[PDB]
Amino acid sequence: GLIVDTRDVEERVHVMRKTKLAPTVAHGVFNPEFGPAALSNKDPRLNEGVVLDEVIFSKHKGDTKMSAEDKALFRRCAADYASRLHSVLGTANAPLSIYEAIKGVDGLDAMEPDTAPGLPWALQGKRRGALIDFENGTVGPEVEAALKLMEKREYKFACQTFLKDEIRPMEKVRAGKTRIVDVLPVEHILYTRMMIGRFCAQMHSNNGPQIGSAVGCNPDVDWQRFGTHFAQYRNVWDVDYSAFDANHCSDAMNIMFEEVFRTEFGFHPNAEWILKTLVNTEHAYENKRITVEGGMPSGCSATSIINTILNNIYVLYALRRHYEGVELDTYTMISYGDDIVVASDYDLDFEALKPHFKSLGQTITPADKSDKGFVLGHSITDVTFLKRHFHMDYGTGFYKPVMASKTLEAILSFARRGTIQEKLISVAGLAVHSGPDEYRRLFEPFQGLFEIPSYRSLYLRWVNAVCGDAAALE
RNA sequence: UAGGGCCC
RNA sequence: GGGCCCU
Ligand SMILES: [Mg+2]
Ligand SMILES: [Mg+2]
DSSP: OEEEEEEEEEEEEOOOOOOSEEEOHHHHHHOOSEEEOOOSTTOTTSOTTOOHHHHTTTTOOOOOOOOHHHHHHHHHHHHHHHHHHHHHHOSOOOOOOHHHHHHOBTTBOOOOTTSOOOTTGGGGTOOGGGTEETTTTEEOHHHHHHHHHHHTTOOOOOEEEEEOOOEEEHHHHHHTOOOEEEEOOHHHHHHHHHHHHHHHHHHHHTOBTTTTBOTTOOHHHHHHHHHHHHTTOSEEEEEEESSTTTTOOHHHHHHHHHHHSOGGGTOOTHHHHHHHTTTEEEEEEEEEEEEEESOOOTTSTTHHHHHHHHHHHHHHHHHHTTSSSOOTTSOEEEEETTEEEEEESSOOOHHHHHHHHHTTTOOEEESSOTTSSOOSOOOGGGOEETTEEEEEOTTTOOEEEEEOHHHHHHHHTEEETTOHHHHHHHHHHHHGGGOHHHHHHHHGGGBTTBOOOOHHHHHHHHHHHHOHHHHHTO
């Protein structure tokens, strides 16, 4: 986005800590080019002359403005995709009750009872459950009143900046490229869910290339679906954006919201409005108050869905900006926020597309930094999506989500106190797909100290999940 | 942490 | 209710 204002007000928003990630036994063994992100402005691992408070915000390099001509075309693209999207999902997009928004519905998990409540509740030591009853699905009086200012379109808010405590490439750690989470007030999340949760539920249940969205998918079983679909195209592209979330422009965002969440689609008129409040935002970080224009806040409700929608619209726009007679079926794609696979039988030229994406403030590069620029003839077994490759299972014939061994090693090398056992079992479900030897190796440093699920048991679990029938009558 | 999915 | 992984 564009930082239009940075100012000091006395009331310190308290965030920075030490990391909670301690190394495991495997760190000594794997020695990964990874480590926890810097959370302190004087972290010794930081390069000489780096300011964390700086780099943290260096993603806001502006809010690209679009011409009337470009705006109109983007609007047609957003209108065209909305049209495909709602034809598939239906138009059952009515608001959710307070209850529904809280407890979830068929396809949408419950709100999280004990995560960050946002501002100003954080500055009063109140916790989310002080404000909302998650057993019963009702709101306390401080939220009810806020709702009321939202039904009235007068509600105002600030985003709370948290540093993300997570593992990173060493290069990026040493650079101060710690990511930030933009925590919104829990009433804003609740109301957005009231406004677009039913839609979101429908998105999750219909995930797939037809709607170009993978939000709600489960890689273990969905890899077979996705694999077979993309297998049948002459060309497949793995496309990388740079700072996708932050570089959404005001115009793109506003127009998308106007085209996709129309009342004629069954949405409450305040769906558009609640969404639009994400365009111009105040961010609280320590003593600082950063006024930003443009960008998606990470960690507002529906953040991944909105990103997925924009991602679909950008591909359509970029191609139409270049070629003629380009329709929704000239290509196919699936997206999860910024992450995307695109495919087409047409010999599209993504190299030529750079400047068209550029018009929305977006910079596309090919996933393989290698040999410079987009090429033709790649297949699905060449690309990555959600940090997984599409490999063929030797024994069922189905595609399986395979994570790179360095990634797995990085992941196994660190954990939070008292969680190794749990984490091990989880990551095991991730590792099974790498095959029995590689599974044995990754887990070797844990032999004797923790319980390691057998390869066989996790393989059999996976088979039953991906096709109950190939368990049964094999 | 918005969320998705999984593990217990 | 706790945890993990991905976006
Ligand atoms: Mg990168
Ligand atoms: Mg990718």
